[PDB]
Amino acid sequence: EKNVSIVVAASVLSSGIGINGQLPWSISEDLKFFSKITNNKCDSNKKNALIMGRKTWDSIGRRPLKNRIIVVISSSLPQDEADPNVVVFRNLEDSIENLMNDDSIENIFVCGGESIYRDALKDNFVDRIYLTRVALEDIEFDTYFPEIPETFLPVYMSQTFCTKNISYDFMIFEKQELKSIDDTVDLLGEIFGIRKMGNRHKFPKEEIYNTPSIRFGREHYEFQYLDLLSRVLENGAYRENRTGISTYSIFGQMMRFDMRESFPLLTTKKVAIRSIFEELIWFIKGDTNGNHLIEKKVYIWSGNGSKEYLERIGLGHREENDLGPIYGFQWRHYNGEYKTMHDDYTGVGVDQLAKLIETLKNNPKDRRHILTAWNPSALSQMALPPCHVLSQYYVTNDNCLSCNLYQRSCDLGLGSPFNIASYAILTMMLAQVCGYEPGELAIFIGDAHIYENHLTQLKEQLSRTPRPFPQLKFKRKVENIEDFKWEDIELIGYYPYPTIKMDMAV
Amino acid sequence: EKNVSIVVAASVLSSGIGINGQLPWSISEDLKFFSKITNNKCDSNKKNALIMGRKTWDSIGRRPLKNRIIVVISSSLPQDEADPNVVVFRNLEDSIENLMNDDSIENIFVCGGESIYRDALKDNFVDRIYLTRVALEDIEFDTYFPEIPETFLPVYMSQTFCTKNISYDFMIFEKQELKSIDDTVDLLGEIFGIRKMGNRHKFPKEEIYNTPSIRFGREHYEFQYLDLLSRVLENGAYRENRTGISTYSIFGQMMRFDMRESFPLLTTKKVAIRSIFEELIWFIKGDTNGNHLIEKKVYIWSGNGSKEYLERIGLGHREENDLGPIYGFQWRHYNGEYKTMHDDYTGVGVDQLAKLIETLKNNPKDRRHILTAWNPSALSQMALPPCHVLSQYYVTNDNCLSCNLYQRSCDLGLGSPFNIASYAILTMMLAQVCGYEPGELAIFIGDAHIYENHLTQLKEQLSRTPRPFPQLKFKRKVENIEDFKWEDIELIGYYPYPTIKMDMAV
Ligand SMILES: NC(=O)C1=CN([C@@H]2O[C@H](COP(=O)(O)OP(=O)(O)OC[C@H]3O[C@@H](n4cnc5c(N)ncnc54)[C@H](OP(=O)(O)O)[C@@H]3O)[C@@H](O)[C@H]2O)C=CC1
Ligand SMILES: NC(=O)C1=CN([C@@H]2O[C@H](COP(=O)(O)OP(=O)(O)OC[C@H]3O[C@@H](n4cnc5c(N)ncnc54)[C@H](OP(=O)(O)O)[C@@H]3O)[C@@H](O)[C@H]2O)C=CC1
Ligand SMILES: CN(Cc1cnc2nc(N)nc(N)c2n1)c1ccc(C(=O)N[C@@H](CCC(=O)O)C(=O)O)cc1
Ligand SMILES: CN(Cc1cnc2nc(N)nc(N)c2n1)c1ccc(C(=O)N[C@@H](CCC(=O)O)C(=O)O)cc1
Ligand SMILES: Nc1nc2[nH]cc(Cc3ccc(C(=O)Nc4ccccc4CC(=O)O)cc3)c2c(=O)[nH]1
Ligand SMILES: Nc1nc2[nH]cc(Cc3ccc(C(=O)Nc4ccccc4CC(=O)O)cc3)c2c(=O)[nH]1
Ligand SMILES: O=c1[nH]c(=O)n([C@H]2C[C@H](O)[C@@H](COP(=O)(O)O)O2)cc1F
Ligand SMILES: O=c1[nH]c(=O)n([C@H]2C[C@H](O)[C@@H](COP(=O)(O)O)O2)cc1F
């Protein structure tokens, strides 16, 4: 009685694994994973057995794999005894004689085809599943991986990797069937109520924890957002704010995101990527005219730029969509005397974005690559004070550009998915203009909250197991950061769950 | 064969437990901990046995404890059979007959005196130790807790609690004697080198991990700093900077600190608390004269305020210790045209600190309580750009004041211990002026680094097991935040390790 594991690489949605007798992709790192996961043994005097169908045996050229014994399932192949590294059995059941005897076999792996996968789960022989989800779907398949039965639960999900612009994950599904420290902490939690800081930061309950079975393997960095969503539902204090819609708020959180091998665009909800870019390039160009976004069918700044909202906050004399000095006016013309959105401010103010780019490539190891937007002198003229307040940038020793963002207030339903993608794109743009590669993205949050009208929606989003991040590449290299266009951005491998509607609190 | 645990409350340094037949302190929460830790049982049809000496039996008034069987060790007391909850044995060895028979006893606890504690460890009967370290030392003891033998290792250290201005911890010492997820992550770490983000954030090795035996119980919030020290020693990239002393730097870190029941002043190194305050009140008053700190014997701003350093950065015309517009000039006179340190700036600039206090008590649930110091227009006039750049404050539903601080650059040897205490004191001052209690302190760090001349010192600091945080209380309630004086601050229960000398990089 030893371990039997399935190793497979299937597509993310349709679970396709083959086409015309070969794989529908060429991922080098995946083959290395298969080689290391099937050679992983504890006894040096034992070998691992790899069960596979005949057509798969034809796919690998009918040649043995080093340090392993290939078990071919076929009714026609002659049970040859010449090659000691290849053995043939007539049916799958007989091949599981590796259990009963043959103590020289330590582990068993089932890396066959649809025919072998299907009647290996149906016959209930599989203990573990090593799944390699690949983000390719608009191609043709003819051989699929069967649906994972409900007896299996995911226990690990790696970060999203990239090979030839193809995103892929690594998951582990397992078949389901000290206390002295935990008890002492519980007893101290009963004595001190909210005096013990642990009780102010309780672990989320299972009913609000996305994919609860993955306990120790929450490596995928979308969990940095889905678990922040859970921490708010658990510890969020019911509070009122400037709007009529109350929130559940906690203070002091952070999220990390990789940008080297993936793009932190959430997959549990279809995020409008075009509107994010059109807002970011709107900041970079220095524009404050709210109509230029409406002319491009971007209505995210319409609520805070209406005639009734401006008169309500004391800016009735201001024009319709004149948001005033905001993001992109403190970036390009800091401390500049703002008049209207039609005047020409070329030359006035401190150009932080220009000095940022000039410093990033003339002094990379400088510790002052900071782009701020909090101007106390201009706060009263703003239609809305800056939420993503201050950002710092960092050049690593391997010529990568990381980014840290502090956010005073975070709408986890609407603003947060945008802010993650927006500052990811901005870091990539700065990397190309300065000649670096994208690094990491860390977002530090002050007032992390959830609007009470988003409770039914965000609980729906938490019920969706995350999919691998897509890839974002630029089609051309620009000479100045202002020259970026929407046609220059190519989003590769984005297969999200259906979009979720959530109303903005004005 | 069941479990035998020691329960004891000893002083932090000398390990005193008694005086004149009674305890040297009155901590209510500690007695509740003893009651719950000795009643913790799994079988409802069994009771726990509490072994204690005769003099301890006199201390509790010779009356039984509910739901427990007290075992008194005494050579003179008559072995009475009347009370079934009290039994007397002639020696400690005979009393450990609870093991051999009497299956109605589930657990055994040794909460005796020095006489019972000493020959319970010497006879090697103890499996676990529940230690309650109390921060009282300048009093008189006559009964001590014996030194913990090397066979025990700490596995848990709770946060610092407060009762009647007395700080105390809870530790657990234990006697020393799935893999499928860990292996898959290791295999992916071999395939992808630094492409897997986990390899850029490696767990610190044991030789640089403070108190490595405490794996799952790093509750004490001094570990938020000692483990950041370890993460830098593990992943820190060797980089040069504006000074001649290179650093080991990582990007994007955070630390949490409780301020309700303790004061985050590091105990692994004696921190000059007076110099921290004199710098903070120097900021609050709006002063930029570097000599006023030297007149108060505070020389932390002498390196960056010398005649040779000012001429080196292009400010030769500036006076000797005229640091220019820095912290405390952007706080009180933001965007104010700076001349010299002798002029009168009363009225010019935006007073953030005043508007911060006015907003904290007139609109607590506001999400804009932000105090910034990054002014791009005044950066060129500064002797040193702001390190603690921007801070945000938050009022909880139970009238507590939390604080978030973003720090672009962090000298983990010198600036970090100061910044932790400085913004802790500032939050407490704002709480008293606004009528709140201290809450939490979260510090978000950009360039967290360690200067290479601090390597021998910081490794020494990592070899010291942390002690409970002290308490900081104000002697009087001030009417304005500027009225605070050093005589008004009382530091209670600070018993740190000896101070460590580290040179500042100018
Ligand atoms: N992405 C991935 O991880 C993997 C993908 N693949 C791909 O899948 C494709 C091949 O898989 P597939 O087409 O399903 O063929 P299979 O690999 O599953 O093998 C099929 C053969 O196995 C034998 N067989 C199957 N069931 C039985 C049975 N109940 N009793 C006796 N013999 C049986 C038959 O051999 P016979 O007719 O001779 O008796 C049959 O022709 C290829 O494109 C391959 O590249 C393969 C492995 C892994
Ligand atoms: N901080 C804490 O957690 C605790 C503190 N304390 C404090 O400690 C003080 C008391 O402890 P302490 O003074 O050490 O006295 P003890 O509680 O250790 O008990 C002493 C008595 O135990 C008996 N005894 C001890 N050793 C032996 C032996 N080898 N054989 C037979 N009998 C033995 C003797 O009784 P006899 O002479 O009658 O034979 C002796 O007088 C008190 O102040 C108490 O409050 C007590 C418990 C816990
Ligand atoms: C056609 N086929 C089946 C195949 C392909 N990809 C997979 N990918 C995954 N994740 N899981 C599988 N079971 C799997 N199976 C193949 C193809 C090549 C090799 C192979 O050459 N393996 C070498 C590895 C070669 C290398 O290191 O790049 C080995 O050492 O096992 C194995 C199976
Ligand atoms: C003198 N003495 C010994 C004593 C005192 N403090 C300690 N504190 C600690 N952490 N550990 C000990 N072993 C300990 N022992 C005492 C004093 C009072 C009670 C006592 O009354 N215990 C009640 C608790 C009373 C309450 O809940 O406040 C119980 O239910 O056990 C026990 C032992
Ligand atoms: N309270 C408050 N005020 C704000 N002022 C400005 C903002 C930024 C902001 C960011 C995002 C959206 C938004 O509608 N997103 C969204 C989400 C899911 C599906 C479709 C869309 C719309 C689309 O297809 O673009 C709106 C506003 C903002 C905020 O998020 N909250
Ligand atoms: N590179 C660089 N530039 C700086 N400019 C300004 C600072 C702030 C700062 C903070 C602390 C100290 C300092 O000497 N601490 C210390 C530590 C241990 C023992 C004794 C003392 C001195 C004492 O008793 O006060 C000096 C400077 C600072 C910095 O920390 N690093
Ligand atoms: O980029 C943004 N990100 C964001 O999260 N918000 C949300 C956060 C909050 O719900 C509201 C502003 O909070 P407040 O108006 O109280 O400062 O806008 C707005 C943005 F523009
Ligand atoms: O409050 C402070 N905290 C701090 O950590 N430093 C250190 C960090 C770094 O070692 C140096 C400034 O880094 P740089 O001069 O490169 O901006 O001062 C200075 C302060 F004033």
GROMACS .gro file of N, CA, C and O and ligand atoms in nm, chain A residues 6-10 17 21-23 25 27-39 50 52 55-56 58-60 65-66 68 110-112 117 130-133 170, ligand 3:
model
  201
    6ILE      N    1  -0.189   1.134  -0.975
    6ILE     CA    2  -0.211   1.170  -1.114
    6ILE      C    3  -0.130   1.296  -1.144
    6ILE      O    4  -0.133   1.393  -1.068
    7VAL      N    5  -0.056   1.293  -1.255
    7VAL     CA    6   0.013   1.411  -1.307
    7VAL      C    7  -0.046   1.443  -1.443
    7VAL      O    8  -0.057   1.355  -1.529
    8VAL      N    9  -0.086   1.569  -1.462
    8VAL     CA   10  -0.156   1.609  -1.584
    8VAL      C   11  -0.139   1.759  -1.603
    8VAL      O   12  -0.123   1.834  -1.506
    9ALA      N   13  -0.142   1.802  -1.729
    9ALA     CA   14  -0.144   1.944  -1.765
    9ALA      C   15  -0.264   1.966  -1.856
    9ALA      O   16  -0.264   1.922  -1.971
   10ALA      N   17  -0.366   2.035  -1.804
   10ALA     CA   18  -0.489   2.059  -1.876
   10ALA      C   19  -0.512   2.209  -1.890
   10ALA      O   20  -0.456   2.290  -1.817
   17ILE      N   21  -0.605   1.841  -2.302
   17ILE     CA   22  -0.470   1.794  -2.271
   17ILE      C   23  -0.394   1.751  -2.396
   17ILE      O   24  -0.273   1.731  -2.391
   21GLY      N   25  -0.259   1.364  -3.135
   21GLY     CA   26  -0.151   1.282  -3.085
   21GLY      C   27  -0.034   1.358  -3.027
   21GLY      O   28   0.074   1.300  -3.013
   22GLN      N   29  -0.052   1.485  -2.992
   22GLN     CA   30   0.054   1.563  -2.931
   22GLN      C   31  -0.007   1.668  -2.840
   22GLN      O   32  -0.129   1.687  -2.836
   23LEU      N   33   0.080   1.736  -2.764
   23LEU     CA   34   0.035   1.839  -2.673
   23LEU      C   35  -0.003   1.966  -2.749
   23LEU      O   36   0.059   1.998  -2.851
   25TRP      N   37   0.060   2.260  -2.661
   25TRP     CA   38   0.149   2.366  -2.618
   25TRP      C   39   0.288   2.308  -2.597
   25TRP      O   40   0.305   2.187  -2.585
   27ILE      N   41   0.564   2.397  -2.327
   27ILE     CA   42   0.608   2.467  -2.207
   27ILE      C   43   0.723   2.387  -2.147
   27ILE      O   44   0.703   2.276  -2.096
   28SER      N   45   0.844   2.444  -2.153
   28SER     CA   46   0.962   2.372  -2.106
   28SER      C   47   0.959   2.349  -1.956
   28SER      O   48   0.992   2.239  -1.909
   29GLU      N   49   0.919   2.450  -1.879
   29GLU     CA   50   0.919   2.437  -1.733
   29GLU      C   51   0.820   2.332  -1.686
   29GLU      O   52   0.840   2.270  -1.581
   30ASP      N   53   0.712   2.309  -1.762
   30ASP     CA   54   0.616   2.206  -1.724
   30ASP      C   55   0.675   2.067  -1.738
   30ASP      O   56   0.653   1.981  -1.652
   31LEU      N   57   0.752   2.042  -1.845
   31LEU     CA   58   0.817   1.913  -1.860
   31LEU      C   59   0.920   1.889  -1.751
   31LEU      O   60   0.938   1.776  -1.704
   32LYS      N   61   0.989   1.995  -1.708
   32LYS     CA   62   1.082   1.982  -1.596
   32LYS      C   63   1.007   1.950  -1.467
   32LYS      O   64   1.057   1.872  -1.384
   33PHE      N   65   0.889   2.008  -1.448
   33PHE     CA   66   0.808   1.975  -1.331
   33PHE      C   67   0.766   1.829  -1.332
   33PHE      O   68   0.773   1.760  -1.230
   34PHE      N   69   0.721   1.779  -1.448
   34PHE     CA   70   0.687   1.638  -1.459
   34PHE      C   71   0.807   1.550  -1.429
   34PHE      O   72   0.794   1.446  -1.363
   35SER      N   73   0.925   1.590  -1.476
   35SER     CA   74   1.044   1.509  -1.454
   35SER      C   75   1.082   1.504  -1.307
   35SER      O   76   1.122   1.398  -1.256
   36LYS      N   77   1.069   1.616  -1.236
   36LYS     CA   78   1.109   1.620  -1.096
   36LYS      C   79   1.002   1.562  -1.005
   36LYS      O   80   1.034   1.505  -0.900
   37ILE      N   81   0.875   1.576  -1.041
   37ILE     CA   82   0.769   1.523  -0.957
   37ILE      C   83   0.759   1.371  -0.969
   37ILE      O   84   0.712   1.306  -0.874
   38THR      N   85   0.802   1.313  -1.080
   38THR     CA   86   0.798   1.168  -1.097
   38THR      C   87   0.927   1.099  -1.055
   38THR      O   88   0.926   0.977  -1.035
   39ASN      N   89   1.036   1.174  -1.041
   39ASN     CA   90   1.161   1.120  -0.989
   39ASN      C   91   1.176   1.140  -0.838
   39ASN      O   92   1.272   1.089  -0.780
   50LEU      N   93   0.552   0.481  -1.379
   50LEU     CA   94   0.472   0.578  -1.454
   50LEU      C   95   0.377   0.502  -1.546
   50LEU      O   96   0.418   0.448  -1.648
   52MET      N   97   0.085   0.481  -1.819
   52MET     CA   98   0.039   0.562  -1.931
   52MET      C   99  -0.025   0.472  -2.036
   52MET      O  100   0.008   0.354  -2.046
   55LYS      N  101  -0.128   0.525  -2.662
   55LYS     CA  102  -0.113   0.642  -2.747
   55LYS      C  103  -0.021   0.746  -2.685
   55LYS      O  104   0.053   0.814  -2.757
   56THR      N  105  -0.022   0.757  -2.552
   56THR     CA  106   0.077   0.841  -2.484
   56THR      C  107   0.217   0.782  -2.498
   56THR      O  108   0.315   0.855  -2.515
   58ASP      N  109   0.320   0.626  -2.750
   58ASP     CA  110   0.364   0.666  -2.883
   58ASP      C  111   0.407   0.812  -2.887
   58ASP      O  112   0.494   0.849  -2.965
   59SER      N  113   0.346   0.896  -2.802
   59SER     CA  114   0.377   1.038  -2.804
   59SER      C  115   0.520   1.066  -2.757
   59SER      O  116   0.581   1.164  -2.803
   60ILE      N  117   0.574   0.984  -2.668
   60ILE     CA  118   0.708   1.006  -2.615
   60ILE      C  119   0.809   0.925  -2.695
   60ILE      O  120   0.921   0.899  -2.649
   65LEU      N  121   1.205   0.649  -1.990
   65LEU     CA  122   1.241   0.767  -1.913
   65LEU      C  123   1.343   0.728  -1.806
   65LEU      O  124   1.329   0.625  -1.740
   66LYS      N  125   1.445   0.812  -1.791
   66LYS     CA  126   1.558   0.779  -1.704
   66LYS      C  127   1.513   0.762  -1.559
   66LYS      O  128   1.428   0.837  -1.510
   68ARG      N  129   1.324   0.563  -1.415
   68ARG     CA  130   1.184   0.532  -1.392
   68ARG      C  131   1.143   0.412  -1.476
   68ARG      O  132   1.204   0.381  -1.578
  110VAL      N  133   0.017   0.821  -1.239
  110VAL     CA  134  -0.074   0.793  -1.350
  110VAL      C  135  -0.074   0.913  -1.444
  110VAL      O  136  -0.154   1.005  -1.429
  111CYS      N  137   0.018   0.913  -1.540
  111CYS     CA  138   0.028   1.020  -1.638
  111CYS      C  139  -0.012   0.971  -1.777
  111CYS      O  140   0.065   0.986  -1.873
  112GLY      N  141  -0.131   0.916  -1.789
  112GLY     CA  142  -0.181   0.862  -1.914
  112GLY      C  143  -0.267   0.961  -1.989
  112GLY      O  144  -0.250   1.083  -1.976
  117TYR      N  145  -0.694   0.824  -1.756
  117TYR     CA  146  -0.737   0.912  -1.648
  117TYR      C  147  -0.879   0.879  -1.602
  117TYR      O  148  -0.907   0.878  -1.482
  130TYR      N  149  -0.172   1.617  -0.941
  130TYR     CA  150  -0.084   1.729  -0.973
  130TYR      C  151  -0.134   1.790  -1.104
  130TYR      O  152  -0.106   1.739  -1.212
  131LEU      N  153  -0.208   1.900  -1.093
  131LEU     CA  154  -0.269   1.965  -1.208
  131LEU      C  155  -0.186   2.087  -1.249
  131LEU      O  156  -0.146   2.167  -1.164
  132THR      N  157  -0.161   2.099  -1.379
  132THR     CA  158  -0.092   2.214  -1.436
  132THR      C  159  -0.192   2.286  -1.527
  132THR      O  160  -0.206   2.251  -1.644
  133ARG      N  161  -0.261   2.386  -1.472
  133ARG     CA  162  -0.359   2.460  -1.550
  133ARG      C  163  -0.289   2.553  -1.648
  133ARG      O  164  -0.205   2.634  -1.609
  170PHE      N  165   0.021   2.573  -1.089
  170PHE     CA  166   0.043   2.438  -1.039
  170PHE      C  167  -0.045   2.418  -0.917
  170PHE      O  168  -0.032   2.490  -0.818
 1015LIG     C1  169   0.385   1.350  -2.417
 1015LIG     N1  170   0.415   1.349  -2.276
 1015LIG     C2  171   0.307   1.339  -2.179
 1015LIG     C3  172   0.298   1.457  -2.086
 1015LIG     C4  173   0.339   1.584  -2.130
 1015LIG     N2  174   0.329   1.688  -2.044
 1015LIG     C5  175   0.281   1.670  -1.917
 1015LIG     N3  176   0.272   1.776  -1.831
 1015LIG     C6  177   0.225   1.757  -1.706
 1015LIG     N4  178   0.216   1.869  -1.616
 1015LIG     N5  179   0.185   1.636  -1.663
 1015LIG     C7  180   0.192   1.528  -1.744
 1015LIG     N6  181   0.150   1.399  -1.698
 1015LIG     C8  182   0.241   1.544  -1.875
 1015LIG     N7  183   0.250   1.438  -1.961
 1015LIG     C9  184   0.553   1.357  -2.229
 1015LIG    C10  185   0.644   1.428  -2.306
 1015LIG    C11  186   0.777   1.439  -2.265
 1015LIG    C12  187   0.819   1.377  -2.148
 1015LIG    C13  188   0.964   1.390  -2.106
 1015LIG     O1  189   1.050   1.400  -2.192
 1015LIG     N8  190   1.003   1.393  -1.967
 1015LIG    C14  191   1.142   1.406  -1.932
 1015LIG    C15  192   1.171   1.550  -1.906
 1015LIG    C16  193   1.243   1.632  -2.009
 1015LIG    C17  194   1.302   1.761  -1.962
 1015LIG     O2  195   1.353   1.766  -1.848
 1015LIG     O3  196   1.271   1.868  -2.020
 1015LIG    C18  197   1.165   1.332  -1.806
 1015LIG     O4  198   1.279   1.333  -1.751
 1015LIG     O5  199   1.070   1.267  -1.755
 1015LIG    C19  200   0.728   1.306  -2.071
 1015LIG    C20  201   0.595   1.295  -2.111
   0.00000   0.00000   0.00000
